[PDB]
Each structure stands twice: as structure tokens, then as C-alpha cells.
Design a protein around this ligand. Sequence first.
Ligand code: A1BJU
Length: 167
Amino acid sequence: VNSFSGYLKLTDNVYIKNADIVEEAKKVKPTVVVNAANVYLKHGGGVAGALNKATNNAMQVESDDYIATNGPLKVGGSCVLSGHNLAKHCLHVVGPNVNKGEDIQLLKSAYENFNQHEVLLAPLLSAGIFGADPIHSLRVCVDTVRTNVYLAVFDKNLYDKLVSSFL
Ligand SMILES: O=C(O)C1(c2ccc(Cl)c(Br)c2)CC1
């Protein structure tokens, strides 16, 4: 039993809700919140910009030190950093950005990072400003993630479309 509330159950391990991931993280304080990161951990907009804003820029400060030490992530890769006031940990995951020409096949590799964590609060990878079809992202999530994932979808219209079209 966990504290996630109001989710629709899609499969044995995947759950979904129309919610602002920032507000959901502040309420649940999950062990892991997933960020929709880029390779530079520049949290400018989309989910990343919103999460970073909620940390009063502490996420960005920590991320800049991470990059200075380690260099950029790979597309499809991830790193674990602090969750600050939102979660115990933040798993920064880089899905391919279609608006940069990146290979959509890398979306499966991106979701594989979730399997290293038993339970996660997450957005749909490569959705929103990353330019992929969120219906496809949900399909890849369900077919790749085996651990327990709670998906927050900000847009109500999109949430209803994802549910109504789910096979
Ligand atoms: O939750 C949402 O509405 C969606 C999303 C996902 C990731 C990012 Cl980065 C942004 Br922006 C938006 C899925 C469309």
C-alpha cells in the first residue's frame, strides 16, 4: 500500500492521473520523482522548468555542479540527484527530443531507467515540448517499465484522450 490517490489503473504496474506533477510531488513526497531532463540538465521549461521553479532553483544549482563534474548525460540516460522539497530523490531522465531530431527509438532506453526504482512518480517521457506523441510514450512506458509507475498528465484534455485510446 502506498499514498498515491485518485489514479486510474492501466495495467498491473502502471497508473495514471490528471495532475500537476509539482503539486502531486509536494503532496505525496514520493521516494522518486522523475524529471523530463535534457542532457545538460538545463531546467528551462516544460516539466523540468516547473520542478526546478518549485525548488527555488536549488535543482538547477545542484545540476550545474553535477554537469561540471561529470559532463552531459546521454539521450536515453539518467542520473539520480536530490529531490529537494519535492521527493527524496529526483531521477533525471533524458527522453529523445523530436524538436532536435533525436531518434524516437531511444524512448524505450529512457524508460528502462525507471526499472531501477521500485516506485516512481513520473511524466510521460518525450511528451510536451519534447515533441513526441504522448499516446506512443504511454505505450512504450507500459511495454517497458516493470516497476510501479504513477504517471501525472498535466493536460486534462490529453489525459482523457490517453485513457480513452488505451489498449
Ligand atoms: O503532462 C502533460 O501534459 C504532458 C507533458 C509531458 C512532459 C513534458 Cl516535458 C511536458 Br511540457 C508535458 C504529456 C503531455
